[PDB]
């Protein structure tokens, strides 16, 4: 009797889902593994309790809307969603997904990867991203901890709470001052708050992830965005005025152009034992100027990935996504209503 508890808090997913086991937490959800008694298989279930904060509601609605509409081998699916039968009773949302074994953050924390693993993982990240971007969506928060792996080295991108249609404009305010667990994978233009950034921000993130697979260390850590820029410039060298084309804040632009000159550090000096083709691709992803970054299609065609490259089996969305309304200018009560309606179809009865 009673609903199961995990590390101290209720997990009300029975009777369909039973035998809960803790997996971990992010900044926003707690994730457990569970036995699905309908499909007779173990699954993952992320609990979120977002309805007291506008931004939590935002993350929840975005991830639900986008993932329910994506279908790709290298992107996590949503199998089911549990929440109370009435909007008033609804305080928590349970997102059920395919169960994965680990993520790239934990793996890299202690485990060495061969050049072949690195190559295969990078390929899968990019195959996933090709689909995301083809749907005219930006992930915006790619990092090792939301690259899931199973035991057969299958990789799946998750954690779409910050994903947005690449509405080539749109002003997403608050995004930069909002809490996240790590900012180490963010492109320099987004850290500097340049409205009008593009798909290239994701490519930058992937570049940071590749660097980390090569060395088991983050390439641009830092206590904050200014310190992070100091790491970035220390390796890529000083930017030109043309590089700062996408840096729109006046003082930030002048600050950057005022700094002491920095020479580029060759990639093979930092990564002395890496495949030289990996370093060439890395060099093309981690370019300061967003418009000169290699895009995802050309990246998949890079000589480093030629052994897995196959455009006959790298599927895209049949049509670009177009978000229903605008979620950033909605009260949390409305966002809750939209979440209720978006999850209605999984209710026992519907």
């Amino acid at each position: 009797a009673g609903p199961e508890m995990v590390r101290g808090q209720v997990f009300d997913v029975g009777p369909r889902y039973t035998n809960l086991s803790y997996i971990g937490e992010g900044a926003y959800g707690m994730v457990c593994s569970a036995y699905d008694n309908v499909n007779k298989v173990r699954v993952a279930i992320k609990k979120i309790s977002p309805f007291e904060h506008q931004t939590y509601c935002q993350r929840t609605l975005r991830e639900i809307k986008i993932l329910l509409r994506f279908r790709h081998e290298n992107i996590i699916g949503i199998n089911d969603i549990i929440r109370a039968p009435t909007i008033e009773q609804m305080k928590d949302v349970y997102i059920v997904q395919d169960l994965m074994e680990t993520d790239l953050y934990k793996l890299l924390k202690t485990q060495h990867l061969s050049n072949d693993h690195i190559c295969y993982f990078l390929y899968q990240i990019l195959r996933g991203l090709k689909y995301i971007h083809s749907a005219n969506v930006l992930h915006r928060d790619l990092k090792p901890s939301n690259l899931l792996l199973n035991t057969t080295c299958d990789l799946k991108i998750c954690d779409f709470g910050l994903a947005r249609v690449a509405d080539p404009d749109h002003d997403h305010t608050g995004f930069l001052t909002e809490y996240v667990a790590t900012r180490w994978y963010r492109a320099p233009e987004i850290m500097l708050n340049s409205k009008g950034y593009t798909k290239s921000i994701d490519i930058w993130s992937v570049g940071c992830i590749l660097a980390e697979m090569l060395s088991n260390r983050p390439i641009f850590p830092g206590k904050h965005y200014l310190d992070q820029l100091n790491h970035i410039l220390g390796i890529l060298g000083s930017p030109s005025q043309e590089d700062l084309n996408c840096i729109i804040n006046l003082k930030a632009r002048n600050y950057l152009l005022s700094l002491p000159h920095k020479n580029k550090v060759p990639w093979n000096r930092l990564f002395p034992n890496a495949d030289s083709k990996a370093l060439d691709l890395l060099d093309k992803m981690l370019t300061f100027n967003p418009h000169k970054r290699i895009e995802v299609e050309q990246a998949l065609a890079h000589p480093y990935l030629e052994q897995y490259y196959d455009p006959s089996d790298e599927p895209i969305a049949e049509a670009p996504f177009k978000f229903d309304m605008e979620l950033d200018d909605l009260p949390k009560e409305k966002l809750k209503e939209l979440i209720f309606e978006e999850t209605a179809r999984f209710q026992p009865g519907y």
Binding site: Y120, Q124, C153, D154, Q307, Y308, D313
Partner: peptide, 15 residues
Amino acid sequence: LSSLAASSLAKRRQQ
């Protein structure tokens, strides 16, 4: 983390 040989995608590319 086996040889990627057991991964289905890598297996599809092994053709």
